[PDB]
């Protein structure tokens with residue numbers, strides 16, 4: 001008998017806006033500890049992982065663990081019916097076939113309730129390994145978004161080169177090439193053990209940056225021979241992480 | 249020798265913006281009492297009725313009654329050439345083949361004049377019956393627009409249920425369903441003799457809401473077995489009314 | 497060994513935004529005196545001429561005269577990677593095959609450098625004759641843009657009639673016709689020896705007005721039997737001029 005009330009409901013709005021173009025359908029793993037989503041994107045390239053801890057909700061209750069199969073476009077459409085000031089409650093019965101979503105304001109003059117048909121998805125839980133990241137860059141999320149958008153007018157791929165002093169983003173294509181150098185100082189901070197130079201598809205990074213509204217900061221974690229992790233903190237609640245294998 | 253000067257010319261701009269998607273061609277009935285338009289929309293579903301009383305114009309003169317056949321897209325295009333601060337004069341000769349439109353500002357530094365070819369439309373005047381509306385809801389026009397837009401992402405039709413205490417808008421479709429409850433308190437006011445529950449096509453309501461800029465308030469009048477009336481007041485001048493039969 | 501530093505880099509951004517829809521490819525004539533571009537548009541109708549004098553750059557150096565063949569769409573794409581506050585340096589070696597563009601800010605926290613492949617274009621320099629313009633209209637660039645946009649909803653051509661007292665823009669098409677009268681007074685100023693009445697394609701004027709951000713003023717120079725000149729000053733630096741033959 002799952003139920004979860006989130007006074008800052010706009011977090012859910014932004015979460016769906018940051019998932020709906022990447023994933024068509026995904027399983028929401030609901031448990032005592034919180035809400036978790038894990039899915040490969042629809043092209044089977046990147047893996048997206050969302051954590052929303054029970055403690056970041058204003059009320060939270062989960063009697064039995066649920067795997068809720070959700071069409072993300074549908075859920076996105078329903079969440080567009082919530083205002084940015086709305087208190088949002090999620091509610092599903094045991095062995096649920098629908099998810100209820102209730103939107104309200106403090107003044108209770110407008111109350112909306114939606115019911116979303118769930119899907120049957122017997123998806124398996126993938127193991128996400130832990131890695132030693134020889135290089136971790138924290139920077140303003142908006143500057144990251146800007147760089148990925150700008151450089152995708154030049155080529156399809158971005159070389160990210162990281163050293164103690166600064167981080168460089170480079171691209172090349174038909175028209176020529178470019179590179180963008182950010183020095184360490186919102187700040188740019190680099191925690192690095194060994195320099196890395198890795199190449200990534202801009203198409204996928206430009207999908208990840210739809211998470212920009214969740215945080216003014218993004219963390220890029222990278223190491224040779226493992227996926228890049230692009231991490232947006234969801235304040236006092238958890239995170240959205242995107243994983244992208246370098247181009248080999 | 250029709251002539252009409254409207255210092256608040258932006259009213260005409262908004263009137264055309266609220267008609268041009270619904271109607272291709274329509275007759276402007278000009279008479280001593282004022283300007284009236286009546287037309288079925290281009291799909292022959294809803295009826296639109298505009299009243300602009302002679303008294304709301306700053307000057308007004310009509311020697312002989314005229315039926316001006318107008319392509320509304322064309323008139324819309326000409327009215328887009330008026331600024332929002334413009335004084336607008338309409339002028340047509342007796343047995344007119346063209347309508348003149350003059351746009352000016354107080355400072356007279358820019359004066360525009362347009363001439364629009366009229367059309368030949370021998371359309372008959374339809375009788376719009378009077379009805380007893382067992383239920384009349386006054387609410388903010390923007391909230392009405394929001395609800396119709398939001399709910400049309402859920403289904404094609406909206407059930408409007410009205411009672412003393414409040415008004416509910418519901419929709420259902422493939423993805424699931426939703427309902428939006430507004431309580432009586434811009435306010436929400438309900439004057440009702442008997443509860444109504446009626447169903448309407450959202451496609452047409454979303455056309456009516458293009459009239460939103462004419463008023464901060466909309467009036468919904470409904471009764472069993474007669475069209476819904478969606479009414480936008482045009483301050484100190486008249487109205488724009490849209491009529492839509494429930495789905496049966 | 498050409499190099500040019502422009503602290504107000506946004507001038508270059510606006511220059512490219514005012515050329516890229518009109519011209520695909522064009523030669524940048526670089527010399528001691530400054531940067532000049534001359535090209536027929538891609539339809540071979542209008543001629544565009546850009547002058548940026550060496551003196552308007554913060555530093556300027558040109559060892560040998562260069563004709564740089566540039567795809568303007570490509571250069572436009574690179575200049576979109578510059579911020580509006582950016583210092584912009586252009587750099588090309590002798591007998592250059594690439595153009596370097598460096599973007600920086602005062603605080604040097606972000607430095608970008610791009611390299612653009614040049615093209616081989618053995619275009620000849622066209623002689624632009626001098627003419628006696630019997631009529632010169634100075635007016636606000638935004639009002640010019642407004643008029644050309646508005647009137648292009650009425651017809652494809654604009655009749656520009658100029659007299660001592662004022663300037664009139666007229667258009668006619670299927671729906672009817674219109675004219676817009678501006679009186680002499682940002683001001684409207686007319687210096688005229690003889691009245692002119694000339695007709696011009698609105699499609700091309702609406703391309704010229706993409707230069708609007710370079711200046712709050714536009715100068716229209718016209719005479720019977722020679723092209724209209726539409727001139728946008730590039731403050732303390734030079735100009736962008738567009739030439740358009742009247743319709744005959």
Ligand SMILES: N[C@@H](Cc1cc(I)c(Oc2ccc(O)c(I)c2)c(I)c1)C(=O)O
Pocket residue numbers: 040044045046047126127128129130131226227243244245
């Ligand atoms: N589904 C894909 C395989 C695939 C599986 C997983 I688990 C992924 O996530 C991570 C995350 C962090 C890591 O360090 C690693 I190593 C992998 C990704 I990116 C791809 C296929 O079909 O090959």
Ligand SMILES: N[C@@H](Cc1cc(I)c(Oc2ccc(O)c(I)c2)c(I)c1)C(=O)O
Pocket residue numbers: 288292293294295374375376377378379474475491492493
């Ligand atoms: N033209 C349509 C018929 C049609 C005629 C009329 I008059 C209409 O307006 C109203 C307005 C208020 C009312 O109470 C009623 I009853 C009808 C409408 I909506 C439709 C056809 O072809 O059947």
Ligand SMILES: N[C@@H](Cc1cc(I)c(Oc2ccc(O)c(I)c2)c(I)c1)C(=O)O
Pocket residue numbers: 536540541542543622623624625626627722723739740741
């Ligand atoms: N390229 C075109 C010819 C063409 C050549 C030139 I030089 C042009 O510029 C001007 C500018 C100011 C003037 O007074 C004149 I006279 C011409 C233009 I407009 C057109 C063709 O192929 O016929």
Ligand SMILES: [Cl-]
Pocket residue numbers: 227245
């Ligand atoms: Cl991988």
Ligand SMILES: [Cl-]
Pocket residue numbers: 475493
């Ligand atoms: Cl009816």
Ligand SMILES: [Cl-]
Pocket residue numbers: 723741
């Ligand atoms: Cl010519």
